[PDB]
Amino acid sequence: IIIATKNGKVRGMQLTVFGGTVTAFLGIPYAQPPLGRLRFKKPQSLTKWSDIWNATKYANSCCQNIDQSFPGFHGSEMWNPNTDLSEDCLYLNVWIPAPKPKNATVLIWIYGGGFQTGTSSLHVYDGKFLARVERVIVVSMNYRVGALGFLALPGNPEAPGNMGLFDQQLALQWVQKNIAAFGGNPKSVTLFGESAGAASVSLHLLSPGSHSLFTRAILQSGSFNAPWAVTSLYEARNRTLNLAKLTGCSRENETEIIKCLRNKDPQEILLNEAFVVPYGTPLSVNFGPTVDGDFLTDMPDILLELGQFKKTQILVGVNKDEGTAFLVYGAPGFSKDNNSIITRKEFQEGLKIFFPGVSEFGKESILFHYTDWVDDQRPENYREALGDVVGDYNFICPALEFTKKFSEWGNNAFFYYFEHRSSKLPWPEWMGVMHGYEIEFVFGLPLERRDQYTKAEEILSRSIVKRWANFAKYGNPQETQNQSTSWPVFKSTEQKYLTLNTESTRIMTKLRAQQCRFWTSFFPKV
Ligand SMILES: *[C@@H]1O[C@H](CO[C@@H]2O[C@@H](C)[C@@H](O)[C@@H](O)[C@@H]2O)[C@@H](O[C@@H]2O[C@H](CO)[C@@H](O)[C@H](O)[C@H]2NC(C)=O)[C@H](O)[C@H]1NC(C)=O
Ligand SMILES: *[C@@H]1O[C@H](CO[C@@H]2O[C@@H](C)[C@@H](O)[C@@H](O)[C@@H]2O)[C@@H](O[C@@H]2O[C@H](CO)[C@@H](O)[C@H](O)[C@H]2NC(C)=O)[C@H](O)[C@H]1NC(C)=O
Ligand SMILES: *[C@@H](O)c1ccc2cccc(OCCCN3CCN(CC#C)CC3)c2n1
Ligand SMILES: *[C@@H]1O[C@H](CO[C@@H]2O[C@@H](C)[C@@H](O)[C@@H](O)[C@@H]2O)[C@@H](O)[C@H](O)[C@H]1NC(C)=O
Ligand SMILES: *[C@@H]1O[C@H](CO[C@@H]2O[C@@H](C)[C@@H](O)[C@@H](O)[C@@H]2O)[C@@H](O)[C@H](O)[C@H]1NC(C)=O
Ligand SMILES: *[C@@H]1O[C@H](CO[C@@H]2O[C@@H](C)[C@@H](O)[C@@H](O)[C@@H]2O)[C@@H](O)[C@H](O)[C@H]1NC(C)=O
Ligand SMILES: CC(=O)N[C@H]1[C@H]([C@H](O)[C@H](O)CO)O[C@@](O)(C(=O)O)C[C@@H]1O
Ligand SMILES: *[C@@H]1O[C@H](CO)[C@@H](O)[C@H](O)[C@H]1NC(C)=O
């Protein structure tokens, strides 16, 4: 099976899936390798080739620091890259149904990982099940992360910022110019992503250069207005200069800093990224999106507030326990290996870990709003409060606020609350419905009966997959055949959302109302 693309022919491979076939094209390049003088620059267009490019294996993942906090543990290592790290990493994957479709809707996955980690080749991002079950085409790409993807000297084309977001965009461009040759409809393209991938999706809704490259958007546990998602121009320069100091690249001609940073090995850049700030937290994003004047024309909170974004349907949601995953990367008293019951003093110490540059008053106000107990003698009170602090501040309330503000300009929005803990979840039970552990349900992994998921999980995934596909194809995330709960539109007044679980799919209103009034309306003042 050979497909003629605009840059040359590519050969794929056949896959057996659920008694059927899916054609996979793993590792198609979509840009010149950003090497040498191209390091830190926007991705450059790809020159034609005259042979057959062999798209039969995942390509290199982009350079990044690896999680080494729990070596050997599947709960952390399932997120580490599973192909070679290299600056030569601008490749993408395509799964197409067999027989080749006629005008298939296209799903484009953008992975998360805090803009500093991630890769399209992870097992939980394998698009072959969606192509098999729903006959959509699934595209995913690698994009640069960390300083190599987001180092910013505003205005300087040698390091303009947002390079990794331009990587994503050049790949959406690739789908526009090429996907019809695979049987895809370039006019029916839905971006979806999780965590920083969702923040990326939300930023593509804002970027005028992305508006004609997709139709609809899905945002899983992430949005650009989350406190970790956008770096200010002030911090970005301070961090670029700090990186230069730590590498001996300090100059005065700012372009000379970049040239010096271009001769450093990826490792030396990587090992210094952590220290460009004085106080880090487990949620630090030292090198991420900025207002560059190119991808992002203004501070995105202003664009959202004033209606300057692509008018289309969105599907947004969050998981019950977004925050807990980050407590074992720093908060005192927490461990994946015990029940992590903490004291009031440990909670207080945890606030200092997560809100280091916040006034004593600000930190008191968090404690005040999250420690008025329904039972002062319940021992896990402080353990659960800190998880809720971190998840509400960093994920849930920004997603809800994004959805409110987006829906106020007339478009249909749909909001979900994912609350099923995977039966295979390797992390301990006190961490609950963790950040990122809906992804396998979205990609349909529980549909493989060989994988030790329960039967209730197979059916939950099956319904989620149908709802996602119906959203991509038709703008409406319903499951219309198996007498399902109808998913109502999220409006700013009633704020209805759908809960996703194995037991009862219910309609609820005003998720985390009191908590989010604190984070969205009071805490930005402190
Ligand atoms: C790209 O692939 C072609 C086709 O071979 C395919 O890939 C192999 C890994 C194997 O799985 C085959 O069954 C597939 O059909 C390669 O063509 C081969 O090229 C070598 C050297 O030119 C030649 O000795 C073989 O006879 C060719 N055919 C086969 C069936 O192997 C081609 O070389 C690949 N391009 C590369 C490696 O750059
Ligand atoms: C839960 O564990 C944390 C983490 O401690 C590590 O992991 C444990 C499972 C065990 O193997 C310890 O030996 C490890 O140090 C405990 O936090 C530590 O508690 C000790 C108690 O003396 C203290 O000296 C350390 O400073 C703590 N370290 C950190 C990083 O918090 C915690 O006490 C355990 N709690 C419960 C309820 O089991
Ligand atoms: C998701 O993209 C996201 C959002 C914010 C943020 C901030 C800092 C660091 C981040 O990623 C760190 C990667 C570690 N992460 C890997 C997965 N682990 C288990 C789970 C789920 C927990 C931590 C970051 N990422
Ligand atoms: C493919 O379809 C085009 C129509 O575009 C799409 O219709 C639905 C699927 C929406 O999701 C939205 O993307 C568009 O309205 C046709 O114009 C085109 O000719 C068709 N091409 C082929 C080869 O079938
Ligand atoms: C801006 O940068 C100042 C200088 O950073 C210092 O040197 C670099 C290499 C790192 O090692 C960093 O830890 C040092 O502090 C900071 O002192 C200053 O606090 C920064 N500004 C803000 C608001 O964080
Ligand atoms: C819908 O359910 C299918 C199997 O369930 C059977 O068929 C439906 C129509 C009802 O009659 C039910 O009582 C039966 O047990 C699944 O094979 C199919 O994947 C499901 N589809 C979705 C989108 O969830
Ligand atoms: C940097 C990198 O990943 N390089 C290459 C790898 C490895 O160098 C070798 O497998 C030995 O490690 O091998 C390939 O050539 C191959 O034939 O699949 C592909 C890839 O370009
Ligand atoms: C910095 O160096 C570049 C490349 O040599 C040059 O074009 C530019 O004019 C220089 N600017 C200053 C202020 O030295």
Phi, psi of 496 (to 5 degrees): -80, 145
Count H helices and E strands in the chain, helices first: 17, 14
Q: In whole angstroms, give the CA distance from residue 293 to residue 337.
A: 46
Pocket test for ligand 6, best of 135, 464, 482, 505 (most atoms within 8 A of CB): 482
Chain position carrying tokens 């991420």: 288
Gyration radius (Cα) of the chain, Å: 22
Would you list which residues are annotated within the binding site?
79, 113-114, 435
Are 316 and 403 contacting, i.e. CB atoms less than 8 angstroms apart? yes
Q: Whose CA is nearest to atom 15 of ligand 6?
A: 482
Q: In DSSP terms, which residues pair with 96 in a beta bridge?
A: 23
Closest by CA position to 223, among listed 117, 152, 303: 303
- The residues that bridge with 318 in the sheet, in sequence order, are 417
> What is the number of the ligand 6 atom nearest to the C-alpha of 481?
9
Q: Probe ligand 1: pick from 10, 25, 53, 54, max atoms within 8 Å of CB?
A: 54
- Other Cβ atoms less than 10 A from the Cβ of 434: the count is 23
Please state, in angstroms and rounded to a whole number, the distance separating the CA atoms of residues 310 and 216. 9
CA distance 42 to 71: 34
449 burial type by CB count under 10 A (0-12 exposed, 13-18 middle, 19+ buried):
exposed
Question: What's at 201, amino acid-wise?
Answer: V
Element (H or E) spanning 346, and its range? helix 344-354
Say how far apart CA 402 and CA 225 lie, in whole Å: 7
DSSP letters spanning 48-102: P-SSEEE-BS--PBPP-----SSTT-HHHHTTS--S-B-S---EEEEEEESSPPS
Q: Report the DSSP pairing between strands 104-110 and 184-194.
A: parallel
**What kind and span of H or E run contains 354?**
helix 344-354
30: three-class secondary structure by DSSP: coil
Whether residue 447 contacts residue 461, with contact meaning beta carbons closer than 8 Å, is answered with: yes
The residue type at 428: P
Cα distances (angstroms) measured from residue 65 to each of 42, 51, 81, 129, 235 = 22, 35, 10, 30, 21
Tokens of 446: 């529980």
**Domains of the chain listed by start with CATH number:** 2-325+392-515 (3.40.50.1820)
Residue found under tokens 């959805």: 403
Q: How many CB atoms lie within 10 A of CB 250?
A: 14
Q: Is 451 in contact with 445 (CB distance < 8 Å)?
A: yes
Nearest ligand atom owner, CA of 321:
3
d(CA 462, CA 301): 36
Between CA 64 and CA 86 the distance in angstroms is 9
> Which helix (H) or strand (E) is 240 found in, with range?
helix 233-246
Type of residue found at 184: G
144 neighbors 460 (Cβ within 8 angstroms): no
Instruction: For a ligand 7 pocket test, name from 84, 85, 86, 87 the mutation site with the most ligand atoms within 8 angstroms of its C-beta.
Output: 84
Q: Shortest CA distance to 8 belongs to which of 56, 52, 58, 59?
A: 52
Please give the backbone phi and psi of residue 3, each rounded to the nearest 5 degrees, phi first. Answer: -115, 130
Cα–Cα distance for residue pair 146/152, rounded to 1 Å:
11
Rounded Cα distance, 297 and 303, in Å: 9
304's torsion region: left (phi>0), alpha (psi -120 to 50) or beta? alpha
Binding-site entries for tacrine:
79, 435
Q: How far is the CA of 142 from the centre of ligand 3 (A)?
A: 17
Report the half-sphere exposure of 188 (CA within 13 A, side-chain side). 19
Residue 491: CB partners within 8 Å, gap ≥ 6? 407
35 lines ligand 7 (CB under 6 A): no
Q: Whose CA is nearest to atom 24 of ligand 2?
A: 333
Burial of 16 (0-12, 13-18, 19+ CB in 10 A): exposed
- What is the 325 CA–ligand 3 centroid distance (Å)? 8
- Asked how this structure was determined, the answer is X-ray
- Residues having CB within 6 Å of any atom of ligand 1: 11, 54
- As a whole number of angstroms, the distance between CA 215 and CA 287 comes to 29
Q: Does residue 99 have a cis bond before it (omega within 30 degrees)?
A: yes
In sequence order, the β-bridge partners of residue 97 are 22
Active-site residue 322, yes or no? yes
Nearest to 276 by CA among 234, 222, 327, 332: 234
The residue contributing the CA closest to ligand 3 atom 10 is: 114
User: What are the residues whose beta carbons fall under 8 Å from the beta carbon of 481, sequence distance 6 or more?
Assistant: none
| In the block, residue with structure tokens 């349909």 | 444
State the amino acid at position 170 in one-letter form: L
Residue 517: CB atoms within 10 A of its CB come to 13
Tokens of 9: 């022919």
Distance CA 192, CA 136 (A): 13
Distance, CA of 407 to CA of 312 (rounded, Å): 10
DSSP string, 469-523: HHHHHHS----TTTTPPP-PPP-TTT-EEEEE-SS---EEESTTHHHHHIIIIIG
| Spatial contact of 34 and 7, defined as CB atoms under 8 Å apart | no
SS3 232: coil
Measure the CA–CA gap between 525 and 519, rounded to whole angstroms: 10
Distances from the Cα of 15 to the Cαs of 12, 219, 265, 496, in angstroms?
A: 10, 29, 38, 40
> Is the Cβ atom of 240 under 6 angstroms away from ligand 3?
no
> Looking at 61, 140, 188, 195, which residue is catalytic?
195
* Ligand 1 midpoint to CA 54 (Å): 9
Q: What is the DSSP string of 148-178?
A: HHH-B-TT-TTSBS-HHHHHHHHHHHHHHHH
| Nearest-10 crossing angle of helices 163-178, 196-204 | 70
Judged by its nearest atom, the ligand closest to the C-alpha of residue 106 is 4
Q: Is 466 in the pocket of ligand 6 (CB under 6 A)?
A: yes
In the reported structure, the alpha carbon of residue 337 is separated from the centroid of ligand 2 by a whole-number distance in angstroms of 9
Round to whole Å and give the CA distance between 494 and 488.
Answer: 10
Non-local CB neighbours of 378 within 8 Å, separated by 6+ positions? none
Q: How far apart are CA 277 and CA 116, in angstroms?
A: 15
The set of residues, in sequence order, having a beta carbon less than 8 Å from that of 383 and lying 6+ positions away, is 334, 339, 340, 341, 342, 430
Q: Nearest ligand to the C-alpha of residue 59? A: 7
Residue nearest to atom 8 of ligand 3 (CA): 283
- β-strand pairing of 52-54 with 8-11: parallel
Residues whose CB falls within 8 Å of the CB of residue 53, separated by 6 or more in sequence, listed in order: 8, 9, 10, 11, 28, 29
- 371 burial (CB, 10 Å; 0-12 / 13-18 / 19+) is middle
Side-by-side strand order, sheet with 52-54: 2-5, 8-11, 52-54
Q: Which residue is it, tokens 């027989």? A: 99
Residue carrying structure tokens 């620091």: 65
Q: Which of 304, 320, 126 is nearest to 223 (CA)?
A: 304
Q: Is 252 helix (H, G, I), strand (E, B) or coil?
A: coil
Kind and range of the H or E element at 200?
helix 196-204
For residue 377 and ligand 8, the question of a CB distance below 6 A is answered with no
Give dist(CA 226, CA 237) in Å, integer: 21
What is the Cα–Cα distance from 114 to 163, expressed in whole angstroms?
A: 15
> For residue 514, what are the contacts with CB-CB under 8 A and spacing of at least 6?
none
What resolution, expressed in A, was reported for this entry?
2.3
120: exposed, middle or buried (Cβ count in 10 Å: 0-12, 13-18, 19+): buried
Alpha-carbon torsion angle 380, 386, 387, 390, nearest 10: 170
- The DSSP bridge pattern shows strands 91-97 and 507-509 to be unpaired
Q: Are 110 and 197 in contact (CB under 8 A)?
A: yes
Of how many residues is the chain composed? 526
What spacing in Å lies between the alpha carbon of 482 and ligand 6's midpoint? 6
H-helix or E-strand spanning residue 214? none
Closest CA to 84 of 57, 102, 104: 57
The number of the ligand nearest the C-alpha atom of 52 reads: 1
C-alpha span between 418 and 484 (Å, rounded): 16
> 284 CB less than 6 Å from ligand 3?
yes
The Cα–Cα gap between 432 and 314 comes to: 26
Could you give the count of Cα atoms lying within 13 Å of 87 in the half-sphere of its Cβ? 22
Largest CA distance in the chain: 72
CB neighbourhood size of 157 (10 A): 12
